[PDB]
Design an enzyme around this catalytic site. Sequence first.
Site, PDB file in Angstrom:
ATOM      1  N   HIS A  67       0.838  -1.194   0.000  1.00  0.00           N
ATOM      2  CA  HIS A  67       0.000   0.000   0.000  1.00  0.00           C
ATOM      3  C   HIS A  67       0.875   1.246   0.000  1.00  0.00           C
ATOM      4  O   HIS A  67       0.591   2.224  -0.701  1.00  0.00           O
ATOM      5  CB  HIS A  67      -0.905   0.011   1.243  1.00  0.00           C
ATOM      6  CG  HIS A  67      -1.500   1.350   1.548  1.00  0.00           C
ATOM      7  ND1 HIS A  67      -2.431   1.957   0.735  1.00  0.00           N
ATOM      8  CD2 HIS A  67      -1.273   2.214   2.568  1.00  0.00           C
ATOM      9  CE1 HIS A  67      -2.754   3.135   1.239  1.00  0.00           C
ATOM     10  NE2 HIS A  67      -2.065   3.316   2.352  1.00  0.00           N
ATOM     11  N   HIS A 119       1.228   5.356  -1.951  1.00  0.00           N
ATOM     12  CA  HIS A 119       1.729   6.645  -1.484  1.00  0.00           C
ATOM     13  C   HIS A 119       2.987   7.201  -2.136  1.00  0.00           C
ATOM     14  O   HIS A 119       3.072   8.391  -2.424  1.00  0.00           O
ATOM     15  CB  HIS A 119       1.986   6.578   0.022  1.00  0.00           C
ATOM     16  CG  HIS A 119       0.744   6.561   0.854  1.00  0.00           C
ATOM     17  ND1 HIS A 119      -0.033   7.682   1.048  1.00  0.00           N
ATOM     18  CD2 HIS A 119       0.163   5.570   1.571  1.00  0.00           C
ATOM     19  CE1 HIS A 119      -1.039   7.384   1.851  1.00  0.00           C
ATOM     20  NE2 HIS A 119      -0.944   6.109   2.182  1.00  0.00           N
ATOM     21  N   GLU A 179      -5.579  10.134   0.549  1.00  0.00           N
ATOM     22  CA  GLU A 179      -5.987   8.737   0.679  1.00  0.00           C
ATOM     23  C   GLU A 179      -7.049   8.246  -0.305  1.00  0.00           C
ATOM     24  O   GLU A 179      -6.933   7.141  -0.829  1.00  0.00           O
ATOM     25  CB  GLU A 179      -6.459   8.453   2.103  1.00  0.00           C
ATOM     26  CG  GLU A 179      -6.198   7.017   2.552  1.00  0.00           C
ATOM     27  CD  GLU A 179      -4.787   6.819   3.092  1.00  0.00           C
ATOM     28  OE1 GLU A 179      -4.442   7.490   4.088  1.00  0.00           O
ATOM     29  OE2 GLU A 179      -4.029   5.997   2.531  1.00  0.00           O
ATOM     30  N   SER A 224      -4.206   1.297  -4.198  1.00  0.00           N
ATOM     31  CA  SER A 224      -3.739   0.010  -3.680  1.00  0.00           C
ATOM     32  C   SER A 224      -4.868  -0.976  -3.400  1.00  0.00           C
ATOM     33  O   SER A 224      -4.647  -2.025  -2.794  1.00  0.00           O
ATOM     34  CB  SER A 224      -2.924   0.216  -2.400  1.00  0.00           C
ATOM     35  OG  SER A 224      -3.739   0.693  -1.347  1.00  0.00           O
TER      36      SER A 224
HETATM   37  C1  LIG Z   1      -3.418  10.585   8.145  1.00  0.00           C
HETATM   38  C2  LIG Z   1      -4.652  10.205   8.914  1.00  0.00           C
HETATM   39  O1  LIG Z   1      -4.609  10.826  10.201  1.00  0.00           O
HETATM   40  C3  LIG Z   1      -4.808   8.662   9.096  1.00  0.00           C
HETATM   41  O2  LIG Z   1      -5.888   8.433  10.006  1.00  0.00           O
HETATM   42  C4  LIG Z   1      -3.535   7.968   9.639  1.00  0.00           C
HETATM   43  N1  LIG Z   1      -2.718   7.303   8.616  1.00  0.00           N
HETATM   44  C5  LIG Z   1      -1.584   6.658   8.975  1.00  0.00           C
HETATM   45  C6  LIG Z   1      -1.150   6.605  10.355  1.00  0.00           C
HETATM   46  N2  LIG Z   1      -0.009   5.950  10.683  1.00  0.00           N
HETATM   47  C7  LIG Z   1       0.738   5.339   9.733  1.00  0.00           C
HETATM   48  N3  LIG Z   1       1.864   4.699  10.091  1.00  0.00           N
HETATM   49  N4  LIG Z   1       0.366   5.366   8.423  1.00  0.00           N
HETATM   50  C8  LIG Z   1      -0.761   6.001   8.023  1.00  0.00           C
HETATM   51  O3  LIG Z   1      -1.122   6.043   6.853  1.00  0.00           O
HETATM   52  N5  LIG Z   1      -1.883   7.210  11.321  1.00  0.00           N
HETATM   53  C9  LIG Z   1      -3.079   7.909  11.045  1.00  0.00           C
HETATM   54 FE   LIG Z   2      -2.069   5.079   3.481  1.00  0.00          FE
END
Ligand SMILES: C[C@H](O)[C@H](O)C1=Nc2c(nc(N)[nH]c2=O)NC1
Ligand SMILES: [Fe+3]
Length: 290
Positions: free
Chosen positions: A169, A174, A214, A233
């Site tokens: 993913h 990303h 996203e 993804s």
């Molecule tokens: C970005 C948004 O707050 C989303 O809920 C989150 N995404 C991610 C996250 N943590 C990681 N490692 N990767 C993510 O994509 N924490 C929170």
């Molecule tokens: Fe993501």
Amino acid sequence: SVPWFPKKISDLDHCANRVLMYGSELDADHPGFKDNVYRKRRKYFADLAMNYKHGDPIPKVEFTEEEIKTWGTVFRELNKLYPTHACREYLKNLPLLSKYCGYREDNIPQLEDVSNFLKERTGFSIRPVAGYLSPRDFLSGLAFRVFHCTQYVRHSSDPFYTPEPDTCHELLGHVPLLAEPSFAQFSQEIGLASLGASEEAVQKLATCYFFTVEFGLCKQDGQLRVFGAGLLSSISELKHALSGHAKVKPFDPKITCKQECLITTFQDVYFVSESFEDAKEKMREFTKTI
Ligand SMILES: C[C@H](O)[C@H](O)C1=Nc2c(nc(N)[nH]c2=O)NC1
Ligand SMILES: [Fe+3]
């Protein structure tokens, strides 16, 4: 008062290990729950992330044949959809990453290599992370052009398993766009606006990030295409979003931030951004009001 927030890139050492979801801990419903070998492997990847500190080259890993094959299937299947489903900015960047970082059906790109490629292109870098962080912590990373990224691979028993996100993913959804200057600027500004911000502010910024980075859509030549990492993804949601089955509205922070971010199911509505430059401008106007 203002909550603690990183002031320099190395400060991310103080929040990168604050994993709230996923990680080495597998639930009874996890595809690899009864796989002793998989459990140990996940502990291994988790440890690499927990022990990582800013400045360290990201530990490179010799992926197993099983992990490489799982990645190959995911990569093969999604790549069949990209030409006709992905936004042009994605299509322009995936080939770039693939050539210089080794994206192949039989080779999983190393995070360190991807990080160095991004560093020279847009200044973005990668930090391995054991699992998902809080929205505040994850967004704080973007302020320094740091994308916290998982390094493990989904269990081989089900290559189409999405409930728990993995490195596929990150790498396919990303990474490519982080090589695009306008997208990198857009992402960093969401991160910068979130630093020390109120809970309500972070929630709104996280929601805008959710419906752009996203699950964002674009309209090119009148055709709806995707740029959201969660869409790029996911075979199922990728198709669903571009089918006349889903509701689609223009990206508009004041409204978009009111939308609930769904997990487990498809989104109730997807938002179309005019361009990364325009989405960035709209967020600037928005953040001035929160
Ligand atoms: C970005 C948004 O707050 C989303 O809920 C989150 N995404 C991610 C996250 N943590 C990681 N490692 N990767 C993510 O994509 N924490 C929170
Ligand atoms: Fe993501």
